[PDB]
Amino acid sequence: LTPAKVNNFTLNFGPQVLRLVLEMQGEIIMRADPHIGLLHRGTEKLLEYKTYLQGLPYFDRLDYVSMMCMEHSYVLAIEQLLNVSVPLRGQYIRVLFSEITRVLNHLLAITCHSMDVGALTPFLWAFEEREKLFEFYERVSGARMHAAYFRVGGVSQDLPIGLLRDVYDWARQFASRLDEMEELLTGNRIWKERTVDVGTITAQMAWDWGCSGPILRASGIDWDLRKTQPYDAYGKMQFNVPIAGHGDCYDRYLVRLQEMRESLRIIYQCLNEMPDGLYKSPDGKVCPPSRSTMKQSMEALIHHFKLYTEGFHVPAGETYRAVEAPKGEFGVYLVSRGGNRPYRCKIRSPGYAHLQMTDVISRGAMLADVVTIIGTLDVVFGEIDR
Amino acid sequence: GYAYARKTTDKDYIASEHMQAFGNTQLTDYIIKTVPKFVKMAVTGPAQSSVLYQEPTIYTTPESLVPLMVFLRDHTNTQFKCLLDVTAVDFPERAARFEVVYHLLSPRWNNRIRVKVCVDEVTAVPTLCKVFNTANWFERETWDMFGVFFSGHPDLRRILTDYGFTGHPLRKDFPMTGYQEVRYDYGKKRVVSEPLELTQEFRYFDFNSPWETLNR
Amino acid sequence: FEHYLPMGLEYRKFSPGTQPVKAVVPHDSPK
Amino acid sequence: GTERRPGESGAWKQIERQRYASDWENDPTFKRTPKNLAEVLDDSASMLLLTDVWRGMAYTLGAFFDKKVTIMYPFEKGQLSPRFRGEHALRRYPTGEERCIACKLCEAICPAQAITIEAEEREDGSRRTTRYDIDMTKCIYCGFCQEACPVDAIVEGPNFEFSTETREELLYDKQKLLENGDKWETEIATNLRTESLYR
Amino acid sequence: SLSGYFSRLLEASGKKSVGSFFASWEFGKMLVDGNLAHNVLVRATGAGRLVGTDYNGNRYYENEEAAYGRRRWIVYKDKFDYNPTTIPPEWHGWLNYINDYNPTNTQFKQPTYQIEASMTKTGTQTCYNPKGSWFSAKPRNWRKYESWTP
Amino acid sequence: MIVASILILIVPVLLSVAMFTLAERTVMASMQRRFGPQVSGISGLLQPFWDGLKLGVKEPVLPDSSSAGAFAASPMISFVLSQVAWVGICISDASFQGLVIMAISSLAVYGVMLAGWASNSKYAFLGCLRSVALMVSYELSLGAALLSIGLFVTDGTGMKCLNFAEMPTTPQYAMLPLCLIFLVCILAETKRDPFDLPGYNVEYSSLGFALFFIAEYANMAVMSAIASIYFLGGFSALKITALFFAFVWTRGTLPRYRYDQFMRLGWKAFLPLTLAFFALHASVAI
Amino acid sequence: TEVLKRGFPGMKSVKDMPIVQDAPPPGGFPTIRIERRLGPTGVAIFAGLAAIMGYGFYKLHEQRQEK
Amino acid sequence: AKGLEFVVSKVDNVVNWARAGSIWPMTFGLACCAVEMMHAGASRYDLDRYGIIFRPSPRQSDAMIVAGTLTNKMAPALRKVYDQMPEPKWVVSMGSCANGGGYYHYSYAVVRGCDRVVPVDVYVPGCPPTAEGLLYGLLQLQKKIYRSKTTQIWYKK
Amino acid sequence: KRLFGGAARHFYFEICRCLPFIQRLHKMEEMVSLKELRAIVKEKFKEYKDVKDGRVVDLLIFKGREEIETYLLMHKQRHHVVTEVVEPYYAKQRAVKKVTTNSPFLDSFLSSGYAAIGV
Amino acid sequence: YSSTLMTADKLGPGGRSSVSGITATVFGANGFLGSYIVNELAKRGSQVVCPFRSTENEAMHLKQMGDLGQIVLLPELDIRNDDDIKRAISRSNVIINCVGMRLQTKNWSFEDVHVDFPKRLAKLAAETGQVQRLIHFSDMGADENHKSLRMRTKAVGDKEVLDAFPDATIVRPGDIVGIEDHFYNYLIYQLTLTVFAPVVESGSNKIQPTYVLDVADAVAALLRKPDTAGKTLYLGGPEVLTMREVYDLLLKTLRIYRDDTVHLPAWAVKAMYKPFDSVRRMLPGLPMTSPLATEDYVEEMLRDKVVPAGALGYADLGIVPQKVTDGLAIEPVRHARVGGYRWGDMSAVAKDIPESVRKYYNI
Ligand SMILES: NC(=O)C1=CN([C@@H]2O[C@H](COP(=O)(O)OP(=O)(O)OC[C@H]3O[C@@H](n4cnc5c(N)ncnc54)[C@H](OP(=O)(O)O)[C@@H]3O)[C@@H](O)[C@H]2O)C=CC1
Ligand code: SF4
Numbered sequence A: 001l002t003p004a005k006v007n008n009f010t011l012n013f014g015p016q017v018l019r020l021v022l023e024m025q026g027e028i029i030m031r032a033d034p035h036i037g038l039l040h041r042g043t044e045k046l047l048e049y050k051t052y053l054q055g056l057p058y059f060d061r062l063d064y065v066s067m068m069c070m071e072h073s074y075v076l077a078i079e080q081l082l083n084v085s086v087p088l089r090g091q092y093i094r095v096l097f098s099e100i101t102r103v104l105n106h107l108l109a110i111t112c113h114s115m116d117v118g119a120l121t122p123f124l125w126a127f128e129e130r131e132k133l134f135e136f137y138e139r140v141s142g143a144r145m146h147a148a149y150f151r152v153g154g155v156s157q158d159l160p161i162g163l164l165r166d167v168y169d170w171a172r173q174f175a176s177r178l179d180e181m182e183e184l185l186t187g188n189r190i191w192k193e194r195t196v197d198v199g200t201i202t203a204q205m206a207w208d209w210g211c212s213g214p215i216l217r218a219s220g221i222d223w224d225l226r227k228t229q230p231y232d233a234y235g236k237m238q239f240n241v242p243i244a245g246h247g248d249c250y251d252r253y254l255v256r257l258q259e260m261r262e263s264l265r266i267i268y269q270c271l272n273e274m275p276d277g278l279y280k281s282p283d284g285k286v287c288p289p290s291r292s293t294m295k296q297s298m299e300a301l302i303h304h305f306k307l308y309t310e311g312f313h314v315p316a317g318e319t320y321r322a323v324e325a326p327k328g329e330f331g332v333y334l335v336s337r338g339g340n341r342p343y344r345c346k347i348r349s350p351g352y353a354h355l356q357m358t359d360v361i362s363r364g365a366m367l368a369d370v371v372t373i374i375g376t377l378d379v380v381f382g383e384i385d386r
Numbered sequence B: 001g002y003a004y005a006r007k008t009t010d011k012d013y014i015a016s017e018h019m020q021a022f023g024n025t026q027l028t029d030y031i032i033k034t035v036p037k038f039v040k041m042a043v044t045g046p047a048q049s050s051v052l053y054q055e056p057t058i059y060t061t062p063e064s065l066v067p068l069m070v071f072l073r074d075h076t077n078t079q080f081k082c083l084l085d086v087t088a089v090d091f092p093e094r095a096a097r098f099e100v101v102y103h104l105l106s107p108r109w110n111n112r113i114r115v116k117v118c119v120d121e122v123t124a125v126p127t128l129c130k131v132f133n134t135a136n137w138f139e140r141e142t143w144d145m146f147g148v149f150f151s152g153h154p155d156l157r158r159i160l161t162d163y164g165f166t167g168h169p170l171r172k173d174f175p176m177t178g179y180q181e182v183r184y185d186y187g188k189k190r191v192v193s194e195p196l197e198l199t200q201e202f203r204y205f206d207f208n209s210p211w212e213t214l215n216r
Numbered sequence C: 001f002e003h004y005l006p007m008g009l010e011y012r013k014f015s016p017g018t019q020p021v022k023a024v025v026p027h028d029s030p031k
Numbered sequence D: 001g002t003e004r005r006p007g008e009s010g011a012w013k014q015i016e017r018q019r020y021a022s023d024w025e026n027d028p029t030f031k032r033t034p035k036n037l038a039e040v041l042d043d044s045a046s047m048l049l050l051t052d053v054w055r056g057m058a059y060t061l062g063a064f065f066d067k068k069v070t071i072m073y074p075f076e077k078g079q080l081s082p083r084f085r086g087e088h089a090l091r092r093y094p095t096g097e098e099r100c101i102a103c104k105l106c107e108a109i110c111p112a113q114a115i116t117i118e119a120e121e122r123e124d125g126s127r128r129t130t131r132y133d134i135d136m137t138k139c140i141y142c143g144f145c146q147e148a149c150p151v152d153a154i155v156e157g158p159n160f161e162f163s164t165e166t167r168e169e170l171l172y173d174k175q176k177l178l179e180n181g182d183k184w185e186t187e188i189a190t191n192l193r194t195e196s197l198y199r
Numbered sequence E: 001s002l003s004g005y006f007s008r009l010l011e012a013s014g015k016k017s018v019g020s021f022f023a024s025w026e027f028g029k030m031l032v033d034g035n036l037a038h039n040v041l042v043r044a045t046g047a048g049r050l051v052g053t054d055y056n057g058n059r060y061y062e063n064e065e066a067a068y069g070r071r072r073w074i075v076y077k078d079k080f081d082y083n084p085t086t087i088p089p090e091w092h093g094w095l096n097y098i099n100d101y102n103p104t105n106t107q108f109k110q111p112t113y114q115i116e117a118s119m120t121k122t123g124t125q126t127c128y129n130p131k132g133s134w135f136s137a138k139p140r141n142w143r144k145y146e147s148w149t150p
Numbered sequence F: 001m002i003v004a005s006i007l008i009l010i011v012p013v014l015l016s017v018a019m020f021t022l023a024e025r026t027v028m029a030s031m032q033r034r035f036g037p038q039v040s041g042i043s044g045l046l047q048p049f050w051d052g053l054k055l056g057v058k059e060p061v062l063p064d065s066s067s068a069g070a071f072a073a074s075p076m077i078s079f080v081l082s083q084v085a086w087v088g089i090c091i092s093d094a095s096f097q098g099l100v101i102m103a104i105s106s107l108a109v110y111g112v113m114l115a116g117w118a119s120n121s122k123y124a125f126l127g128c129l130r131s132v133a134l135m136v137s138y139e140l141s142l143g144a145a146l147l148s149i150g151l152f153v154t155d156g157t158g159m160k161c162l163n164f165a166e167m168p169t170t171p172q173y174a175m176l177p178l179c180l181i182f183l184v185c186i187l188a189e190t191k192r193d194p195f196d197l198p199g200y201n202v203e204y205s206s207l208g209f210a211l212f213f214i215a216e217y218a219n220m221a222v223m224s225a226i227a228s229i230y231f232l233g234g235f236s237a238l239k240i241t242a243l244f245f246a247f248v249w250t251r252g253t254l255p256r257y258r259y260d261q262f263m264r265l266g267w268k269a270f271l272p273l274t275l276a277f278f279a280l281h282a283s284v285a286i
Numbered sequence G: 001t002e003v004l005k006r007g008f009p010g011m012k013s014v015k016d017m018p019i020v021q022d023a024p025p026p027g028g029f030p031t032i033r034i035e036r037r038l039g040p041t042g043v044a045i046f047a048g049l050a051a052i053m054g055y056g057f058y059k060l061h062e063q064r065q066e067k
Numbered sequence H: 001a002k003g004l005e006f007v008v009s010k011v012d013n014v015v016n017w018a019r020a021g022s023i024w025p026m027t028f029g030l031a032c033c034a035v036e037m038m039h040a041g042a043s044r045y046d047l048d049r050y051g052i053i054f055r056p057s058p059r060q061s062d063a064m065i066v067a068g069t070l071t072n073k074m075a076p077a078l079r080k081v082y083d084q085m086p087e088p089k090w091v092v093s094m095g096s097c098a099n100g101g102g103y104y105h106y107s108y109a110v111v112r113g114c115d116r117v118v119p120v121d122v123y124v125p126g127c128p129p130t131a132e133g134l135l136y137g138l139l140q141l142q143k144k145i146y147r148s149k150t151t152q153i154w155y156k157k
Numbered sequence I: 001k002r003l004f005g006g007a008a009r010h011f012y013f014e015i016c017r018c019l020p021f022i023q024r025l026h027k028m029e030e031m032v033s034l035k036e037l038r039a040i041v042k043e044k045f046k047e048y049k050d051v052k053d054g055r056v057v058d059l060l061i062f063k064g065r066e067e068i069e070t071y072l073l074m075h076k077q078r079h080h081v082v083t084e085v086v087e088p089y090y091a092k093q094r095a096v097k098k099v100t101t102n103s104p105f106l107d108s109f110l111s112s113g114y115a116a117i118g119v
Numbered sequence J: 001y002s003s004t005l006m007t008a009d010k011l012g013p014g015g016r017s018s019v020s021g022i023t024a025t026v027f028g029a030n031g032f033l034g035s036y037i038v039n040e041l042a043k044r045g046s047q048v049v050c051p052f053r054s055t056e057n058e059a060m061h062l063k064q065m066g067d068l069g070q071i072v073l074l075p076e077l078d079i080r081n082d083d084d085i086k087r088a089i090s091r092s093n094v095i096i097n098c099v100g101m102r103l104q105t106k107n108w109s110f111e112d113v114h115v116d117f118p119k120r121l122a123k124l125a126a127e128t129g130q131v132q133r134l135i136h137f138s139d140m141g142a143d144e145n146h147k148s149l150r151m152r153t154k155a156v157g158d159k160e161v162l163d164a165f166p167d168a169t170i171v172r173p174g175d176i177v178g179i180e181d182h183f184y185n186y187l188i189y190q191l192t193l194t195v196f197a198p199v200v201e202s203g204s205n206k207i208q209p210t211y212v213l214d215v216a217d218a219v220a221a222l223l224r225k226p227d228t229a230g231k232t233l234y235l236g237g238p239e240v241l242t243m244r245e246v247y248d249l250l251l252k253t254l255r256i257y258r259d260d261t262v263h264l265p266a267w268a269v270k271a272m273y274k275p276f277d278s279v280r281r282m283l284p285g286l287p288m289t290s291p292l293a294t295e296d297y298v299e300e301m302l303r304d305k306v307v308p309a310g311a312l313g314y315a316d317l318g319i320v321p322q323k324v325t326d327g328l329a330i331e332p333v334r335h336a337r338v339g340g341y342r343w344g345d346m347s348a349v350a351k352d353i354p355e356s357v358r359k360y361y362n363i
C-alpha cells in the first residue's frame, strides 16, 4: 500500500544499545523513529518456568541502576495475593534502602546526563559516593548490585551491627557533596542554554503520554505514590515534594536534585526511628525459618525442604501493584492460577513509556538535543526491553 | 490535565471521605447502572492502588471498548486520565484463548481500574491510539508477543523480537528456548540462524504435590 | 562544609567480621 | 543561580516569544529588570567578565590541591563483608569427610540450572555424590544455593579473582570445588563464625 | 630523614645495600613498571609499620593515620611476576578489610587437609581441565551403559 | 643548518604535546579527586610514548568506496600546517609574521572538511561542517583582535610591523577585554570546551588519529604562544604552561554550548565588540 | 526452640529473652543539613578594570612618545 | 648470530611492553556489567591509570570487553564492530551473560555466550564481576600479551 | 469475482511492484533477475494455498507486509538475503536430478534413528 | 576403517552440539586453506587439534570455530621435532597437512618443508597404528620433471608419502580462490599499486581455478568415501581459461580502463627477478613480497596447469564445482570495487546502469 519513491534524506543514528532513525529537512528534526528490542531477553516467558523465589533475581536485572525498588513491587504483588503483613522493622529497612537506591539512580542519571552534555567532573565525583553506597549494599547482602535482599514477608537478613553508624556518617557529608556538585552546572549559563526550554512537555500531554516520576513533577503536577498511595512506612515519613512548571530539562534537573534532598531527609528520619523487633513475617509456611531453627526442629526442616524445592502456592487470582520508582512508576501485573509458579507476570516500565515521547518531543529540535532528550528521559533499556 | 499543585502546605490526607467511600464501595455499581450494555461481567479485585481497599475489573466485547474507554477517561466521576498499559493473557483451555488487559489511573481521585476483553486469534481489536497516545507501543508489543491484531492502527509492526523473527514467544504453546539459534560461520563470513541445539538440555522439575488443594 | 574521605577510625572503624559485641537476632515471636 | 534571562533559552519558540512578548516578565522565576545604574552594572558584570565560570573554576582548582581516593591495586584492595558471594566451593568436616550429602536441594533451588548432580551410596553405605558440577559461566552467584544447603556444604568463597583465559577452565567439577574448599576453608569458617549470628 | 628512608627502603626491597638495590634487575623493572616502583619507593617508605610475613615471603604493613580504604598494603616478594593469588587466605581477610584478624594476632585452626596458596596456572597447559577434555590424562566416554564386545 | 633548526624545533613540539595530553589527563584526574595515569611508567611518565607506539603498530584501515588519497593527506595536511606554523613562530622574520600565522591557521579548516567529505559517514558529513563554520566565524574576530594589536606595534626605525622581537616586553593592561575575547576565540579554535560539540575523525585510525591529535594540540600551543607574545608581554615556557593549565582548568569545569548558540554568540557579541575596540584603539592611537 | 537459642540458664519466662540488634545509639543521631547552602561589587570591579586599563593607556602613550 | 637473536628478544620485550600498557577498548553499554565497567574507570579504580582509554571507534580500539548480555538481534552488529577492529586485537569476556548465557541461557533470543560469534581471549566471571575482578582480568590479559613473541617467530620463519 | 475478493493476488502484485528496488538496493544484479525473484515470491505464497478463512489470509498478508517492509528499510542485512533468498535458489537449482536411487524411507533409515527436523 | 570413521561414533543430527566421533589434527590450520578445512570438520561435530608456529594472535580466529573442548591449540610447534607431532596425533585417527611454502628462506628450504617433514609425519602416522586417514595436499602443477623447484619437491614429497603410507589420500587442487587467497590478492597487488604488470610470454597457458568451499566439501566427501584412500584426486573448476583471459576478466571486474600488463620473454622476466632470488637465502624473509617474482612462477606460466585427462576429480565425489568467474566467490573481489556504485570513470558499464539514468545521458 506504500511505495518508497523519494529516498532523499537518510540517516542512521547508532547501532551502539539504542538504534535511532531520524528525519530532518536540514538542521532541524522533523521525525524520529527509535527501534528497540536489542535487549529484549524474553524474561516474561522465562518467568513462567521459575518459582516465585526462583524468578526474584530476574527483577534485579530489569533496572540494574535501581534494584530494590524493582524487587519491592513484585514482592508486594505476591504478598497482597498472599494476604501477608510485613513487620515494622522490615518496612523501615525497605524504605531506607529504597531511598538509598533512589539516591544512586538520581546520581548516576544526572552524571550521565552531564557527561552527554559535556561535564565530566560530576560523573567522577558522584561515583565515589556511589561506591560508598555499593559498599553499604555489599555489607548487607554480599552483592554490589544484584542483592536479592527483599523477600516475601520481609528481607533475607537483618542489618549487620555498625551499619547505621556509617550511614549517618555518609549522610553527614552527602549534602556537601551535592552542594559542590551543583556549583558546576547550577550557576552556569552554558548548562542552562543547553538545557533550558529543550523538550517542553505539558501536563495534558504527559498524562496522555503516561509520564511518571520526576518528569511528571516538573509540569506543575502534585503527585507522589508515596503520598497518594503509600506503601510500607512511607505514610509515616514527612518530606516535601519539589514542583516545577515549565517541563524543561533544567527543570527536571532541579527536580531530581530536590528529590535527592528529600531522599536524604527520609534517610535521616528512618535512621533516627529504627525499631527493634522481627524482620521477617512469622509465617513459616511462606517465609523460610532460621537455620538454627531448621537444624533443631522437624517442622522448620520440613518447611525449609518444601519451600526451597516447591515453594508456597499462591491462591488463584490477579493483582497489579506499582512502586514510585526513581525513573517513574514501576508496576508488575501478576496472574495466579493456584500453583507454585506465577501463571503470567507482565512488567510495566516507566522508561518504556517515556521513550515513546521522542518523536513528538524531538520535533523542532536539533541533533545536539537528541542526546539531551535521551539523557533527560532517564531510560534503562533493561526495563524497556524485557 | 489535572493533579496540579494547589496547596502550598504538606498534605496529611488522601482524597475526600465521600469520594473515597463511593469509589471503594459503589463505584462498580455506578459503572453497572450507567452503561450496562458496556458491562458484561464485574469483578471487584485486590485494589491495585492500595492494599486496604477494593477496586473493580471490567469485561466486555471488543465492539464497545472504545466508547467505554472514552467514558472512563471523560466522565466527571471517572477521570481516568492515565492508561497504564495494555497487555494480554493466554487461556489455551478456552474457546477464546486471549484476555487483553487495560489498566487506568485516576489522579483526580487517587483510584485505578482494570478493563479486560476476551478474544480469539482471528478477531480484530479496535485501536485505542485515538484515546491514548501510549497505546501505540503497547499494542505493538502485544501483537509482537501474541499476534493480537488491532484494527485501524497507523503502523502495527513488531517491536521486540528479531527482525526476521516469525512467531509470538509469549504464547503458551511457544517453546521456552524456541526453534532457531544463531551463530557466526567463518566459511560464509556471515552470522546465520541454525536449528536449535543444546549442549545440556533443559531440566523440568515436577514439584507440584498430589495433595495441594489450591490448584486451579 | 563537610569533607569527603574521613581519616582513620572516623568511618567503618571495625571490619564486619569483628564486631565488638555479640549479635542477638530474634527469630520467633515470644507470643 | 536558578534564575532565567531573555536570550538564554536554547530554543526558537521561546526566544521568539520573549523578544516579541513580555510573558517572561509575569514569570517570577525570571530575574527582574535592573532599575538603576548600579543594577545595570551588576547585570553587565554578570553577563560579561564571566563571574559564573569563575566559581566552578575555583572549586575545581581547590580540588586540584585536594586529596584523592585512588587505591594501588593489586598492592591494595577494597573493603568487603563476610556476606560476600563469590566463587562457589565445597566444604568438608574437620575429620575430612565431605559435608555435601547429595540431598540435591542446591540443584532444586538453583534458578540458573547450572548445577548437575549424580550420586549413589558409597561402598561404606554413605550417601555421597558421584558427579558434582556447577557451571560458573552459567552460575549467577545469587547465593540461593548457600541459603538452601542445610549442612553448610556449598559456599560462595571470598575468592573473586579467578578469571581464566579459556571458558573450559570455568566448568567446575567436584574435584576443583573440593580443592577450592580445602584452600579457603579457614576464611569461610571465620566468616561463618560471624554470619552464624545472622544466618 | 634520609638514613631512615634508606633503612626502610632496604628492609622493604629485601636487599643488603643501596648499591645492591640500584644495580639489581628489580630496580630496572621498577624503571618500567610505575605501580611496582610506587610500591617500592612511596607507599612502603611512608609513616607506618610492618605487620607480618607470610610463608611466601610477602610483607604486610599497616598505617592507622591513613584514610579509610587505604590503611593496609602488601609488598609481593616476586618482583617480576607479582600476583594476588599467592596471598594466603589467613591474610586475605585482613587485606580485604573483611576482618581485623591476622596470624600475628589471631591463632586460627589449621585443617590437616589444608592446601597452601600459590600462583594461578591459568593460560598454561598445566591448568585444570574437565575430565572430558583432550588435555586430560585418560579421556572419558560418559556413556551411561556398557557396550557388548564379542 | 636550516633543516637542523627545523628539527630542533620539531623535537620539543612532539615531546611536549605528548606531555600536554598526559598532563591534561592527570590534572583532570586531580580536579576529579583521582590520580590519573600513574602505572604506565614512573608516576605514569611514559603513557603518551606507549600510546603513540601502539597506534603506530595498529592496523590502518581504508574504506573501499571513497578517495583514500584525501583520507591519507588530510591529517598529513594538518600536521604540515602545524609544523609550518611552528616554523613561522620560531624561524621567521616576516614583517607581517602575526598575519602570516593567522593566514596559516585559516588553512587548518580544510583537514576537517577533507576528512568529512572523504569518509562515507553522515554525521561526519554534518560535524565537519559545524566545526568548519565555528572556526571560520571566529577567525574574523581573531583577525580583528590582531588588527587592534597592530595599532601599537612599532619598531625603533618607526615602521609599523608585526615582528615578534619588536613586541613590547610588557603586558598590555589597556586591552584586557580584547585579551579576554581573544582567549575565548582561541578556545573556540581548538574545538575545546565550551566549543567541543563537534568526532570528524571517527572513521580514522592509527598514526592518522595520532597526527590529528598532534595537529590539534600543536595548534593549541601555537595559539598559546601567540597570546603570550601579544598580551603577556613576551614568549616563554612558563606562560605556555600557565595558559595550558588554565585551558585544562576551563575544560574540566564547563559544559559545551549548542551549535547555533555559539554561532549567535560569536556573530552578535564577539565580532562587534572587537570592531568597536579596534575603532577605539585606532582613534586613541592617532 | 528459640528458648534454646536466645534463652539463658535460669530463664523464668520467654518475655525475658534479650535482643541485640543494629540500633541507633541512645537519643538518636545528630541533625544534618538538608537544603542548599550558598560577590564583588560591580562598581568596584569596573573601577579596578578602568584603573588598570588607564595605566595601560598611559604606558602606551609614554612608549609611543619614546618610539 | 647470538647477538642478533638477543636483539630480536629485546625488541619483542619492548613490543609487548608497548602493546600491553596502552590497550584501548571500545564501549558496548549492553547491560549490567557496563555499570561495573563504568565504575572501573572511575576515581577509586582508575582504569586510565593502567593506560586504558575508551575510544568512540573500533578503528582505534585495541580489544573488546563484552559487558552485558548479547541477543540474536544484536549479534550481527557485534560481529560488525569486531570485524571493524584492526589487528592486533583481543576480546575480553566479562559476565556470565557474556560467558555462557547464565541467567538467560535457555532463552529463545539470547546468544549462549559471545564465544559462539567471536573469539575470546579473557573470560571474567561474575554476575556482575567486581570492578576489582575486571582489573585482575585485564592484568591477566597483560600477562598473556607479555608472553607473546612475534619477531622471535618471524626471524625463525 | 475471486475467492475472498482475491486479496492474495493484490498482495503479490504489490510485492512484485516493490521487488526491483530490493534487487538494486541489495546488489542482486549479479545473482538474480526480476523473473526468478518473482518465482521465489510466488513459491512463498504456495505455503498456504489451502487456507479456508479470510481472516487468516488477512493476517498472513499483514505479516507479509511487515516482512517486506523490514526488507524495505534494510533492517535485515545482506546475510538475511544470503540465508533466505539466493542460496536457497542455488541449492534448489543445484541438487536437481540427484543420483540416489534409494527410497526416502530407506534414506531416513540410512540417515539416523530419528527423522530430520528444522532448516 | 572403511566407513567406521564417519559412522561409529556419530551422535546428533550433525550440528555444533552434535558429535561426529572424528578426531583429527590439521597442520597449517591457520593457513588459508587449513582454516576453512578445520572450520568445515568441526562444524559437523568433530574433535580438531590445531598446532601452530605463528602467533596466537593470528590463531585466535580458529578458537571460535569449535565448541568447548573441541579446539586444541598447541603453540610453539617445531616441524624438526617429532615429539610435538607425536603429541599432536596421539588421539587422532585422521591426519591432515596443509603446511606449504612458496618462497625459499635461509631457515627453511623447499625440501625441508615439502619432503622430509611429510615423510616423517607419515612414518609416525604408520607407527601410531590407530590412524585411519592421512590427508596430504599438493599442487596440480606438481610433476617430477618440472624446472620449478617447489613443484618438484611437492611431487617428490607426494611419492614419499605414498610409499610410506599406502592408504593416504593425495589431493592436488589448482588455483584456489578466496577472500585471503594467494591467487587473486597478489594479482590485485600487481594490477594496482604498481606501475606495470609483467606477463610471461604470450600468457596463453591454461589453468583451472577452483573455490575453497568446494575443497572443504571435497575433504568432507573424501572422509565419507572409503575408496578414495590411497589414491590421488585433482580439483579444478568447470572452465578452462588462460592467464590473458583471467587478466581481461579481472580488469573488467576492476573496470580498469588502462591495460597495465605487458607480454615479455621469459628470460627478461627471470633477469628482472634474478637479483632478488640470488639473495633469497641469508635473509629471514620479508613482508609484502608476492610469490610471483620467482623463476619457478615463470616456469609455471610456460606450462598448462589443469586436471589431467582421466584424473579423479569433483565428479568422483558427486560434487558440482560452483562458478568461480562469477557468483558468491566473486563478491569479495568485487568489494575492491565495492560492487560498483560510483567508482571509476567507466562508460562501458552502461549495460547495468538503471533505465532513467541512461535516457538522462542519452545512449
Ligand atoms: N591455490 C593454493 O593456494 C594452493 C594451495 N596448495 C597447498 O595448500 C596449502 C595451503 O595453501 P595456503 O594456505 O593458500 O598457503 P598459506 O601460505 O596461506 O598456508 C601457509 C601455512 O603453512 C604454514 N607453514 C609453512 N611452512 C611452515 C613451517 N616451516 N613450519 C610451520 N608452519 C609452516 C604457515 O604457517 P605460518 O602461518 O606460521 O607461516 C601457514 O599456516 C599449502 O600447503 C599449498 O601447498 C596447493 C595447490 C594450490
Ligand atoms: S551441596 Fe548441600 S544442598 Fe547441595 S546436594 Fe550437597 S548437601 Fe544438598
Ligand code: SF4
Binding pocket: D088, D109, D110, D111, D112, D114, D115, D134, D138, D139, D140, D141, D142, D143, D144, D145, D146, D156
Ligand atoms: S550461587 Fe546461585 S547460581 Fe551459583 S550455584 Fe548457588 S544457586 Fe546456583
Ligand code: SF4
Binding pocket: A061, A064, H031, H032, H033, H034, H067, H068, H069, H094, H095, H096, H097, H098, H102, H103, H126, H127, H128, H129
Ligand atoms: S552477567 Fe549479570 S550483571 Fe552482568 S550484564 Fe549479565 S545479568 Fe547483568
